[PDB]
Amino acid sequence: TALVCDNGSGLVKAGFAGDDAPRAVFPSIVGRPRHQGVMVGMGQKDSYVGDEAQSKRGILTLKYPIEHGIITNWDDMEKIWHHTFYNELRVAPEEHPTLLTEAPLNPKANREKMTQIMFETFNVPAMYVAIQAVLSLYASGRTTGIVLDSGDGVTHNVPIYEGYALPHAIMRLDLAGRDLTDYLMKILTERGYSFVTTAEREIVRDIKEKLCYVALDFENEMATAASSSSLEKSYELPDGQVITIGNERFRCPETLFQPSFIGMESAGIHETTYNSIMKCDIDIRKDLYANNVMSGGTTMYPGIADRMQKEITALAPSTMKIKIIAPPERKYSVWIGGSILASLSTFQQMWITKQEYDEAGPSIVHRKCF
Amino acid sequence: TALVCDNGSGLVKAGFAGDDAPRAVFPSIVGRPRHQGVMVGMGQKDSYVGDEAQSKRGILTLKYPIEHGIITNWDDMEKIWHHTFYNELRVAPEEHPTLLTEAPLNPKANREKMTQIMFETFNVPAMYVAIQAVLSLYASGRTTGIVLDSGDGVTHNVPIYEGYALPHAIMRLDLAGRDLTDYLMKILTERGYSFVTTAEREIVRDIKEKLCYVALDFENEMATAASSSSLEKSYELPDGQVITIGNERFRCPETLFQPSFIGMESAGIHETTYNSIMKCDIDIRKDLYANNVMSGGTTMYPGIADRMQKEITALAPSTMKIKIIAPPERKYSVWIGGSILASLSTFQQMWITKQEYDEAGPSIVHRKCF
Amino acid sequence: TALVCDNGSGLVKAGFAGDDAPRAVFPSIVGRPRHQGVMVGMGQKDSYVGDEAQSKRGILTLKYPIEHGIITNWDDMEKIWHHTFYNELRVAPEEHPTLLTEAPLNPKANREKMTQIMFETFNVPAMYVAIQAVLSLYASGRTTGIVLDSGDGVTHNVPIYEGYALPHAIMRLDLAGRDLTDYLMKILTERGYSFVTTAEREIVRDIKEKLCYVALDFENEMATAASSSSLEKSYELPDGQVITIGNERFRCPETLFQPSFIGMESAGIHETTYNSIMKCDIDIRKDLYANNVMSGGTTMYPGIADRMQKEITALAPSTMKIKIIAPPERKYSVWIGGSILASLSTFQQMWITKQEYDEAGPSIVHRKCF
Amino acid sequence: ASFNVPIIMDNGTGYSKLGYAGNDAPSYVFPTVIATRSKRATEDLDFFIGNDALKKASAGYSLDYPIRHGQIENWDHMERFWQQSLFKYLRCEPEDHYFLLTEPPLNPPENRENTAEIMFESFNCAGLYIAVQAVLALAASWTSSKVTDRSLTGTVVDSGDGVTHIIPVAEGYVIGSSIKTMPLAGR
Amino acid sequence: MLSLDYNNIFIYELLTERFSSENPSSIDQVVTDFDGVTFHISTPEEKTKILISLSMKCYPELVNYGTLDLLKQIYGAYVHEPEMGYNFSILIDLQQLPATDEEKEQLAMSISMLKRNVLAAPFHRAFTKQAELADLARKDPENAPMLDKQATSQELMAIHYRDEETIVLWPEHDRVTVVFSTKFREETDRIFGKVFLQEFVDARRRPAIQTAPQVLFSYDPPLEIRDIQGIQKGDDFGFVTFVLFERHFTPQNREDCISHIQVFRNTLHFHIKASKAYMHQRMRKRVADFQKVLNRAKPDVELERKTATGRSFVRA
Ligand SMILES: Nc1ncnc2c1ncn2[C@@H]1O[C@H](COP(=O)(O)OP(=O)(O)O)[C@@H](O)[C@H]1O
Ligand SMILES: Nc1ncnc2c1ncn2[C@@H]1O[C@H](COP(=O)(O)OP(=O)(O)O)[C@@H](O)[C@H]1O
Ligand SMILES: Nc1ncnc2c1ncn2[C@@H]1O[C@H](COP(=O)(O)OP(=O)(O)O)[C@@H](O)[C@H]1O
Numbered sequence A, B, C: 001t002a003l004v005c006d007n008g009s010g011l012v013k014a015g016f017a018g019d020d021a022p023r024a025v026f027p028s029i030v031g032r033p034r035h036q037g038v039m040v041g042m043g044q045k046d047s048y049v050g051d052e053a054q055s056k057r058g059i060l061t062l063k064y065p066i067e068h069g070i071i072t073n074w075d076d077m078e079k080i081w082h083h084t085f086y087n088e089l090r091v092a093p094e095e096h097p098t099l100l101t102e103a104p105l106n107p108k109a110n111r112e113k114m115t116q117i118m119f120e121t122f123n124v125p126a127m128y129v130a131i132q133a134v135l136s137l138y139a140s141g142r143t144t145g146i147v148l149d150s151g152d153g154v155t156h157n158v159p160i161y162e163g164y165a166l167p168h169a170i171m172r173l174d175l176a177g178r179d180l181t182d183y184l185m186k187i188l189t190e191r192g193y194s195f196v197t198t199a200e201r202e203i204v205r206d207i208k209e210k211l212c213y214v215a216l217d218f219e220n221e222m223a224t225a226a227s228s229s230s231l232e233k234s235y236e237l238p239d240g241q242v243i244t245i246g247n248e249r250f251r252c253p254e255t256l257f258q259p260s261f262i263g264m265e266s267a268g269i270h271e272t273t274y275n276s277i278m279k280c281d282i283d284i285r286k287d288l289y290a291n292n293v294m295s296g297g298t299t300m301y302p303g304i305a306d307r308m309q310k311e312i313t314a315l316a317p318s319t320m321k322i323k324i325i326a327p328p329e330r331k332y333s334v335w336i337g338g339s340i341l342a343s344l345s346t347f348q349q350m351w352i353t354k355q356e357y358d359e360a361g362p363s364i365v366h367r368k369c370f
Numbered sequence D: 001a002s003f004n005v006p007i008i009m010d011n012g013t014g015y016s017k018l019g020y021a022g023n024d025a026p027s028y029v030f031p032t033v034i035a036t037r038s039k040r041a042t043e044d045l046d047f048f049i050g051n052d053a054l055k056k057a058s059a060g061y062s063l064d065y066p067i068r069h070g071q072i073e074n075w076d077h078m079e080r081f082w083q084q085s086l087f088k089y090l091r092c093e094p095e096d097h098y099f100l101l102t103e104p105p106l107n108p109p110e111n112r113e114n115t116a117e118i119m120f121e122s123f124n125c126a127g128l129y130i131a132v133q134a135v136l137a138l139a140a141s142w143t144s145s146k147v148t149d150r151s152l153t154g155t156v157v158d159s160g161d162g163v164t165h166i167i168p169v170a171e172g173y174v175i176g177s178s179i180k181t182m183p184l185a186g187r
Numbered sequence E: 001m002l003s004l005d006y007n008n009i010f011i012y013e014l015l016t017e018r019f020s021s022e023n024p025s026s027i028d029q030v031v032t033d034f035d036g037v038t039f040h041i042s043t044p045e046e047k048t049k050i051l052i053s054l055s056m057k058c059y060p061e062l063v064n065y066g067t068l069d070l071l072k073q074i075y076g077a078y079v080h081e082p083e084m085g086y087n088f089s090i091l092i093d094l095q096q097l098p099a100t101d102e103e104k105e106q107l108a109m110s111i112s113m114l115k116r117n118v119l120a121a122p123f124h125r126a127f128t129k130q131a132e133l134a135d136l137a138r139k140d141p142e143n144a145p146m147l148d149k150q151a152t153s154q155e156l157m158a159i160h161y162r163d164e165e166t167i168v169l170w171p172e173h174d175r176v177t178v179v180f181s182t183k184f185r186e187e188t189d190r191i192f193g194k195v196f197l198q199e200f201v202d203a204r205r206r207p208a209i210q211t212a213p214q215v216l217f218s219y220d221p222p223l224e225i226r227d228i229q230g231i232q233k234g235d236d237f238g239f240v241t242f243v244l245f246e247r248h249f250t251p252q253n254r255e256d257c258i259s260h261i262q263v264f265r266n267t268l269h270f271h272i273k274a275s276k277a278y279m280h281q282r283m284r285k286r287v288a289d290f291q292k293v294l295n296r297a298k299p300d301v302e303l304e305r306k307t308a309t310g311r312s313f314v315r316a
């Protein structure tokens, strides 16, 4: 069996090809102690990673090696990969071929360096680097559709027709779950709650995951939340203190539809999705509109598929159906589709093998992978 | 083995690493005669120390060389340390490492002169200075908690999470059992009884140690004593005359909760403990609330743990379990935890050594004992 | 004539539009007596404000109704505004429109209560609530710049280009001169000096602003202080006791560059200034580097403009001039800027008039002010 | 062997004397001390040695003497002391040069083993001679290098910072059965 | 140390002593350096007069690239006839020194800096000729491609500066390119050196250091050096290329850039050594972790109480 990893910008999803769900899902985080250990014989470690960094976060500064789908810290990424292999899956990396995964329109250096580290540091037998949105069609059982994938670091559109991608119509938006956590920390300040530290950011991420939703019509929802407390909810901090939340409960996710809330000049997720369909050839658009696939954690908000169908129906011509397939497992659909792909008998000649890498160098990945 | 010398403000507590309790426990006092020494011979001395000063006190001016946790008189502190080694433990200090202790937020020079006298007067092979509240946490069997330690001269709060101290959240309060003894002299004067001399200050310290206690609700206890004989009881002086007291039994300890009784502008020991928890990072607060550790003789009052729990429960949010840990041996927890620490094998590498002091001078303590 | 009142966390600055300095500068303090008032007559009051509280402080518990730029005590803040208008400026507030100030990223309730109290108790005809660092740019005579403002409670960076603020690039740090004063109380304890009453905090505040300075290279000044007497200076307490102080003169202000000295996870003021420029659009950064405007009392240290210029030159690319702009009057520049804005002939349409408050209520302020 | 001048390192308990064969003095004579610190890990790069370590006690570095009573006892610190000797002070490439090292007559088999692996695997020197130290001090006693001035029989009393040892040598042969050591010297 | 000094530290300290000294003693001191370089420092006729002489296997190549002109410009009246077995020499007379401590200090620095001054002439020839090509390309931008193509062969410097390194460099109107034809012959340094040379090139692809010279790497040679005599494509050499653009040798920065590029392979060689000391501390830390897994096989027994010297104790 192959390994498959979505090295996501916020969570690692790792496991074996042919299994139904990731074996290991954990924070894509390394934490380091900020205070001095006064107590002798304690289990003091130089750094912590994943769920152990998340558990100990009150004494750690927390860093993510991936920002916007780009590996910005290679040492902390190597710590995360070492943790995936030896601690989480607890298999030696030399034994199984590994399907890694990436966002489209990344730096070419990100994929080469990821390839060089797997073959020369972890000594893997073979590996591949798939596009996250292509895997989301494999999980959905499609060969035609436009995938809106939105994780922690990047949002992207990939249109595919009958197994052919249209790489000129691919869209990237460096706005996803982390930018919505940053913005929820900022708009929590105006109700008087201060979240500042790297650990308080993880509490605000949990507030966003538990309470936020997408409002089907933002100005009617803003008028509703100004009229009564009925839209308000409460969250209890690890301190046992309670915070109450109101219009900032849906004004946070609206940054996906209104990127100007975080000050960036770009189209919202509905307009980048429509612009991706309108960059495609005219005969395929009619089938892309019926096959909008949603994937990744930032597509998990209550009401987002209803908002997304409403907005795409207003942009598209009214003479044809808009359908959006946002399945309940879509949080793991990139990994599920990678497990399907790495399990196909017709895929087993598509791996980059170690013997084929060390006659070509890490640029082999640009001609074996999309 | 190593000596552990918890040279506190009011009692010296001393013994060996790995012993169940201190085998030397005596007043931190030097006494000097205040009267005409008329009989020649008679076994007379220029000064007296500890239990010898406490038993001769009717003819001696008594003074403590240590006040508010700071050595004010080094010549009498050498006299006390000599009494610990040669009279009370009966050891050569040049044969044994010594673990010393002090309160946090002390003058730098206190640590320096204390290391200098240990290496240059007592010729010690090795020594260390521990923070008293960090020692008290080993005596609890804990590696996280907030320790409220109150001795004779100082009260302090130190929060520790998973062996990391949070030094910004450490609180000191220069109010403890000597301030409560002075206040008991001031209020005993209102019922008819004047205690004035340094010898009479030891009688009223002994009254405080067995008549006084902490009320669970001060204004109800104050009204119950104002309207009944039931809170009143008596004590017999060395002179055989009897002292009766009532609300003085709980008004004295209430100064820990209401420092304004002695003219101080500070939070009480309950609110100082809460302010220390609230200076810590938000994720650690839950485990600090569940681990409030009491220490030192000023925590030995009846009812103080029940009062401390009542008061912190009103300050913290109701959504969590406040627990106060008040062992019956908490009279000695700093010494007990020093005997744990001095017996650990990594601690054998943490000592300042004679050779290392001789190469560096007394500043070596600031770059090795934290 | 309009009034301008800059509600500082530590000082009120107040006066009239078109004047070149504030008429009233006084402590943002209310004091109440904490001792027995044994003497009838002799000019006593139940409470004292500003300079009266500062002169009588030995007998008072002082407190500031502002914490980190937020009003935490509204009844005391009414007493400060009443003192400002009736005692210190000697005006009827019903006759003059008032320009007020606050920090960015404040609670909305702060601005609502501040507009409500001003119309509904002071009967002000019209009022406005400016961002403090937008006013500091008016005083500097500029349309573009990044303003580092640091007062008593908050440090904030707001970048402005051609009169447009970038609200997403605004940085806030709840660390300024109160936190530096409390850290100086902390580290004065290691030299042997105890300052603990809120009146003694005002003595340490005065030690800070007569003796402290910013070291251009901190680790070299630490080595220089460890090997010289030349660093050390002396201060006369109100008691006529003389303290002497050394590396604590530059360790206190270095907390702005190393917030971990007070146990904060935040980046230093040089890093938050650079992070704020790097959140701006790439075309405006050149003019922000050349216009780093400094304001507020926590920017008044000797050598702070030079350390700020050195550190931001180490972050930025070397091909463009970093200019720190540090006016000699920069301690008042927010108030100077309010005097300009309230005097501008284009501003009189921007006031909230009581006629607008009478129909909209206090929520008017969020749509009239930035 | 290589035609480059051999490099001479006498690492004493007090002082290290560093230089090149045939010079009229050591190039360096400085204490056998290391100043060490007590998101990438670099605290093993941050050390100093010799006169430049004595300057670092006020900067919060812990000073240590990795040689005590004549014997190396901290091989982490002695490896860092040698790399800094070779690349800072002597400014040399070990692959080009043969080295003369020294230690006391008593010194453990373990010390010469640990010395050889640092010299041949860490630094990769071309070759190593670990000399019997006071046997060299007999040869320094000659009035000149010429064979007629040599006195190949003599007792040598060596007393440095850490140990003093008395070595009998006759006709150039060391009478190892007759070595005496006193554990007391300049320190 | 994280970075190597550029100057010979012994020559700097010795001259800083002798330029201050009340009573100079004689000296006779051969002193090694990196890259097979050697110095002789001596007082050959008086204690008053110090002769400093440099021996360097590539000095005949360096003379072809204008080295004597630069050494006469730097050392001036102090230049002396070469000593036997040495390529260059300078005589300093201790009674003829500059009138100030700061002029004396920068002279002691200048003479300690002599290995990087003899080796700087091909870099100054490239920088000054790039300024000619820059002015001609600024005159006619459509003729510039032919000037760059001819300068890539007619204005190329190669220095075989040690038997396992060739530095090759040339001007073009907007740059100086320099290629280190580089090798480690010691097998553990070849293995660690592959990691160092790989991570060196990947570092330049990250956002934080885009301000640096462009770097490229291979292990065949860059196209424009493939036919330089002594370059060889199968002979285990890697080829590190630096493209210095006009901003890397601006007048405020030329001498630091020259000093810093010459020490490239020396910092890499030094850090390949210092990495072993790091790996050894990484190892012995987890030898101490594996101790705790064996310590759980020791059954728990109380030891008798002992004094600091280990003598038995009789109390408690
Ligand atoms: N239920 C949810 N509702 C809203 N946001 C979510 C939810 N679950 C996860 N997220 C966001 O999505 C991120 C993880 O999604 P994922 O698809 O795994 O991203 P990635 O692949 O980049 O790691 C989280 O860190 C958080 O920002
Ligand atoms: N049972 C008690 N009840 C009240 N106070 C006590 C009791 N036992 C001891 N104390 C007081 O505690 C102080 C001594 O406590 P200790 O922890 O030994 O202080 P220290 O270490 O600073 O010398 C004295 O003020 C003493 O009177
Ligand atoms: N010269 C100075 N040097 C250093 N600190 C100063 C100086 N003058 C005032 N401060 C500090 O700055 C604050 C007062 O500055 P100010 O700008 O008026 O603050 P605010 O507006 O927020 O009240 C106080 O915390 C004070 O301690």
Ligand SMILES: Nc1ncnc2c1ncn2[C@@H]1O[C@H](COP(=O)(O)OP(=O)(O)O)[C@@H](O)[C@H]1O
Pocket (backbone or CB within 6 Å): D011, D012, D013, D014, D015, D016, D159, D160, D161, D162, D163, D185, D186, D187
């Ligand atoms: N003039 C002197 N008189 C006495 N002792 C000296 C003198 N000069 C140096 N020393 C001492 O000699 C010792 C250093 O001698 P050295 O041979 O270099 O020792 P080692 O080789 O063991 O390190 C030190 O104790 C030093 O103080």
Ligand SMILES: [Mg+2]
Pocket (backbone or CB within 6 Å): A006, A007, A008, A009, A132, A151, A296, A334
């Ligand atoms: Mg993903």
Ligand SMILES: [Mg+2]
Pocket (backbone or CB within 6 Å): B008, B009, B010, B150, B151, B152, B153, B296
């Ligand atoms: Mg005590």
Ligand SMILES: [Mg+2]
Pocket (backbone or CB within 6 Å): C007, C008, C009, C010, C150, C151, C152, C153, C296
């Ligand atoms: Mg202010």
Ligand SMILES: [Mg+2]
Pocket (backbone or CB within 6 Å): D011, D012, D013, D014, D159, D160, D161, D162
């Ligand atoms: Mg010796």
